[PDB]
Amino acid sequence: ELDQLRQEAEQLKNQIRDARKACADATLSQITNNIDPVGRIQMRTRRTLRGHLAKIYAMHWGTDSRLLVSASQDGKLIIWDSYTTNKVHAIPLRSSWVMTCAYAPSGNYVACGGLDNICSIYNLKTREGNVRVSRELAGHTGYLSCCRFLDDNQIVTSSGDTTCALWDIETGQQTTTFTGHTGDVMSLSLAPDTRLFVSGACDASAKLWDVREGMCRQTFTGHESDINAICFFPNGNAFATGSDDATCRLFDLRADQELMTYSHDNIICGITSVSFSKSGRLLLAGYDDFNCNVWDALKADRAGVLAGHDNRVSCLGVTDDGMAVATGSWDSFLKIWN
Amino acid sequence: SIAQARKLVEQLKMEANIDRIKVSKAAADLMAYCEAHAKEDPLLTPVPASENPFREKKFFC
Amino acid sequence: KKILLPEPSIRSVMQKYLEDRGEVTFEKIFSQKLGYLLFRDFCLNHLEEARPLVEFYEEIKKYEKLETEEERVARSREIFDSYIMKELLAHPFSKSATEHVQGHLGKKQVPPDLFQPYIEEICQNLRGDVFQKFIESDKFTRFCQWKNVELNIHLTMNDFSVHRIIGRGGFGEVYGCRKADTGKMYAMKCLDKKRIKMKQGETLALNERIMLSLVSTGDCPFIVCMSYAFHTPDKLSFILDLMNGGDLHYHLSQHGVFSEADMRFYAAEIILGLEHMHNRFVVYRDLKPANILLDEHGHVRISDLGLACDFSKKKPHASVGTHGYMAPEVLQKGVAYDSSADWFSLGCMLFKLLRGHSPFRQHKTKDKHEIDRMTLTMAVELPDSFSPELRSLLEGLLQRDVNRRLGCLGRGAQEVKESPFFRSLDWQMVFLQKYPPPLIPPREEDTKGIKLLDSDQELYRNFPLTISERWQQEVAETVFDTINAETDRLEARKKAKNKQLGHEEDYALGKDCIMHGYMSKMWQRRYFYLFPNRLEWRGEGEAPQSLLTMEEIQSVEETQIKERKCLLLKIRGGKQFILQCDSDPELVQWKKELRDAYREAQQLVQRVPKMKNKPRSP
Ligand SMILES: O=C(N[C@@H]1CNCCC[C@H]1OC(=O)c1cc(O)c(C(=O)c2c(O)cccc2C(=O)O)c(O)c1)c1ccc(O)cc1
Ligand SMILES: [Mg+2]
């Protein structure tokens, strides 16, 4: 009876492999083989944001493409003005072990959390001006790895308890829970339409979740190690991942399989972050070797390298308006590039 | 458990029961997206120095 | 020259030092002079709910100290009339407790015990929320300022202003001196380290320090007590009670023999002194008049504690003492003994004050072995002039059989007290040093072939000591009142100054700071904050712009920098960070709380893939 279902457990897995090979008529690199290359992209560092006193673990742009939050080992969140270097707010946290952070699309709130196992929501403009905690989200029995807002009153978090969860910020409860991963969840990315979101984990698999219905539609394996970061393609029908194997991978949803692999033989360390340019032609990957690389997403060629950090690039992100890229590092500085 | 095994079989039937399009069509639609919006991407199509905040822009809102 | 208290921020370190040793309990603080004084300040001045309770406690204590029964009956009813009608209308007392008190009162019987039930019930109410409110208050902050000073006591000859010689010996000479810290009058006893090595007085000198320490607790008026002990590179040193009246052997030369009426006085105070030593399981073993001293008023104490001995864990069997005053069981080869011996010495000494020599000393002989042979064999022939109640006493003391001797049958000192000789005295009054005294006093290069090795110095490694209630009493009766006011002015002035500067509130509040305080980096003094994952620091002006993470720390060790103990952090990048501290409690706690900090930190990271160190090199 236990045996009886473990045969069908793999009879269906093989039904899926064969189901997918039927679609593998041609590869992306073949179709793209015709288009002009993007050519060398020599972005220079245009700002250095100095303030944090120790490692940066996570950053996040605001929707205005000017303000950005950054979490840090030093126990502070900072909100910077990229155009001038000015700090808008230096928020000191109630727990030193922060790992993630996030800016509301509205820009009225920010969030963070870590080994405290709580996603704390901060109100960036009180009825006076003082920045204060407006809610703590206790629930997970594991470290908070990442989190993103849908709107002011909803947030989605991932945790090392091997699960994700969608929150209702007012009541501070879990509307929906996302069980499925068999290892620590590490990152997530919202679809632009928001009805979906993808997640990545230490089981070397990523999963597309049906936000509203609350279940896993698809599971994309292929990676040989812990998927550390993940990112949606602007149209929302494909996403990229980064892993400790030293490769990025592009997965398409409608094709239901891996499309592309980005990996030079010289690149042997892990990937810590991923982000597409505004059109989606460029895939920027952050590496443990201090460099952010720039991939031609369609041709799988390395367009160029963002190199100017003295330690791991621990996070990155393009602005909405595509004007600039920001890299955050263990050297304690963020840097804006273009 | 048997609950744990039956959970998986129900899910793996749920993953097989999605329809799929051809990778040829999958790639062709992405390449359609990049080509299209390439004009508006400033990391590919740079804008005037004065209109870019991180180069020579002077006036701000 | 004068005591400067540390700043209030010391609390952060000290509280954690005390919490770890369980010394932050009502019963631990309350039973300390400085702890009590600060507590009662708070209750009286800064908490109306506690005021009557303490006021009432202090009133009961003054009643205990009343001399006689007729004074008590007065104060007894006097007390129940006033405060009790306020407290019974409040915080009521128990029926069970009032029953006993009112039972005695109804019969007009008034012991000190009378109010003991009300003491216990007061404490019940003082140790609950009233205590926790005290811990949160600035008077606990002030207790910690003082406690820091106590546990950081490092003494040298700079601290004392030495005056005149008042005694020679074998290894050194006793002086009279003032402590510049408080301006307290003391007697110094400096033993030369080059002399002690020349005489093999190694276990002997190290013994005295232990013996002085064991007797000095409890606040006794009849033994020359120690407050401190310390050493310099070439000398040992004791700080003992001052006595400017000379020894009883010198006065016996100038006064001749004393009368019974006068011998009683000395005997009483000497007895109560011995009682103190015996209840603390210490045998003195050399009671002679030369070891008894007089203060300027005339009263006596016991002094030379070199030959004394602990007998709790095992009983001694040596032949220790002066040859005229040793008990028979001391002189015998392997006969063990306890407090027994000091009673035989009392008889021998009390005889000499009446007749001018030891009863076993005869023809002014100077033959130790003959004198010892009188003790064991000769029955002591008592004079006829002697009173009957005196004969009763002495032959009780000089009885050879230990089972047949007074003060060894079970009740110890009490058997001698209740003797027929002391039938007139009220022993409480003796203790209170209230009876009038009979007498009031009127107004080298031999060790140059012997070097001091650093192996010999380690034998005195744990020599220095400071008796806690002694130092606390010293401060209490001198500089404690005036220094609190001065450091109160500073701490209000610094706050008033910071208010004009637009005071920024503590960087440590509202976060998860473990602890915080001053230290010096490398010297550069800076204020630190230890967080669970890092150790920040700032200069006097701005917030911390510099730090060191916990994962960077390989090991926290301790090492020397120009003969001062410091912490030696080893950073992962092959670098070293050195920290100095303003006091020893700080050194112990920083060392600990970092060792716990980085060890916790490094395990937490292990789990987290987002924070740990992954492979790079092929
Ligand atoms: O103890 C005092 N005086 C004593 C009285 N006994 C008679 C001898 C004089 C004097 O003793 C000393 O000055 C003295 C000095 C010493 O260095 C030593 C010792 O080194 C010593 C010792 O500490 C323990 C055992 C033996 C000896 C020794 O010298 O043989 C000593 O025993 C007495 C005394 C104590 C306090 C005070 O305020 C004033 C005086
Ligand atoms: Mg013996």
Coordinates of N, CA and C in Angstrom, one line a residue, chain C residues 1-6 34 145-146 148-150 153 179-183 228 471 474-476 478-480 482-484 486-487 490:
Chain C
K1 N 43.1 61.6 45.6 CA 43.2 61.3 47.0 C 41.9 60.8 47.6
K2 N 40.8 61.3 47.1 CA 39.5 60.9 47.7 C 38.7 60.0 46.7
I3 N 37.8 59.3 47.3 CA 37.0 58.3 46.5 C 36.1 59.1 45.4
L4 N 36.3 58.7 44.2 CA 35.4 59.2 43.1 C 34.6 58.0 42.6
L5 N 33.3 58.1 42.7 CA 32.4 57.0 42.2 C 32.4 57.0 40.7
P6 N 32.2 55.8 40.1 CA 32.0 55.7 38.7 C 30.7 56.2 38.2
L34 N 25.8 49.4 53.4 CA 25.6 50.4 52.3 C 24.3 50.0 51.5
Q145 N 27.2 51.7 41.9 CA 28.3 52.6 41.8 C 29.3 52.3 43.0
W146 N 28.7 52.1 44.2 CA 29.5 51.8 45.4 C 30.1 50.4 45.4
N148 N 30.9 48.6 42.8 CA 32.1 48.6 41.9 C 33.4 49.0 42.6
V149 N 33.3 50.0 43.4 CA 34.4 50.5 44.2 C 35.0 49.5 45.1
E150 N 34.0 48.7 45.8 CA 34.4 47.7 46.7 C 35.2 46.6 46.1
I153 N 39.2 47.3 44.8 CA 40.1 47.8 45.8 C 41.5 47.3 45.6
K179 N 44.3 56.1 56.6 CA 43.9 55.8 55.3 C 43.5 57.1 54.6
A180 N 44.3 57.5 53.6 CA 44.0 58.8 52.9 C 42.7 58.8 52.1
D181 N 42.2 57.6 51.8 CA 40.9 57.4 51.1 C 39.8 58.0 51.9
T182 N 39.6 57.6 53.1 CA 38.5 58.0 54.0 C 39.0 58.9 55.2
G183 N 40.3 58.8 55.5 CA 40.8 59.5 56.7 C 40.4 58.7 58.0
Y228 N 41.8 45.1 55.7 CA 42.4 44.8 54.5 C 43.7 44.0 54.7
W471 N 35.0 47.2 55.1 CA 35.2 48.3 54.2 C 33.9 49.1 54.2
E474 N 33.6 51.2 57.4 CA 34.5 52.3 57.2 C 33.9 53.5 56.4
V475 N 33.5 53.2 55.2 CA 32.9 54.2 54.3 C 31.6 54.8 55.0
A476 N 30.8 54.0 55.6 CA 29.6 54.4 56.2 C 29.8 55.5 57.3
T478 N 32.3 57.5 57.7 CA 33.1 58.6 57.3 C 32.6 59.3 56.0
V479 N 32.9 58.9 54.8 CA 32.7 59.6 53.6 C 31.4 59.3 52.8
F480 N 30.6 58.4 53.3 CA 29.5 57.9 52.5 C 28.4 58.9 52.3
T482 N 28.7 62.3 52.5 CA 29.1 63.5 51.7 C 29.4 63.2 50.3
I483 N 29.8 62.0 50.0 CA 30.2 61.6 48.6 C 28.9 61.4 47.8
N484 N 27.9 60.8 48.3 CA 26.6 60.6 47.7 C 26.1 62.0 47.2
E486 N 27.8 64.7 46.5 CA 28.7 65.2 45.5 C 28.5 64.6 44.1
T487 N 28.3 63.2 44.1 CA 28.1 62.5 42.9 C 26.6 62.7 42.4
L490 N 26.9 66.0 40.4 CA 27.5 65.8 39.1 C 26.4 65.2 38.2

